[PDB]
């Protein structure tokens, strides 16, 4: 269930509401500023890191479940999304339908959206690919 969630349902949740569009109308008292802007922030592919922990001083290092249990940390991994930034401008002529075009400011770019707690021995956890001797090295019970 957790492997299905992480593999597909996270991407499905991102892609249902991937795009977000805000229109700034001209609000033009004079016809010299008859332009309407359309700023779209679009989410794309989602990436999941290996389970990590950031310390106080900004040091981010790989977190193992024994260390998390000992130090009262959350055995979680970071979620990143691709964000691409479309911007459009149109000539705000009343009556005529607005036609938007890119100004080629299409910046895109993984950004951090939060930490997903990782259930142990799932495909994201370190203990899935570990052998029995590796579990003994990591002080985890086989």
């Amino acid at each position: 269930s957790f492997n299905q969630f992480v593999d597909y349902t996270l991407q499905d949740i991102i892609c249902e509401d991937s795009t977000l569009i805000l229109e700034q109308l001209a609000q033009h008292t004079t016809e010299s500023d008859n332009i309407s802007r359309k700023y779209e922030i679009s989410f794309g592919k989602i990436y999941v890191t290996k389970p990590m922990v950031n310390e106080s001083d900004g040091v981010t290092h790989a977190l193992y479940p024994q260390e998390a249990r000992l130090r009262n940390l959350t055995y979680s991994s970071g979620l990143f999304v691709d964000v691409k930034k479309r911007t459009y401008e149109a000539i705000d002529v009343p009556g005529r339908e607005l036609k938007y075009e890119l100004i080629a400011e299409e910046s895109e770019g993984k950004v951090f959206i939060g930490r997903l707690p990782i259930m142990l021995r799932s495909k994201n956890c370190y203990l899935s690919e570990a052998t029995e001797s590796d579990l003994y090295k990591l002080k985890e019970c086989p």
């Binding site: 569009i21 229109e23 609000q27």
Partner: peptide
């Protein structure tokens, strides 16, 4: 007086 910005539900 006109609202400057508004949300568009994508379709």
């Amino acid at each position: 007086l006109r609202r400057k910005t508004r949300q568009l539900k994508v379709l």
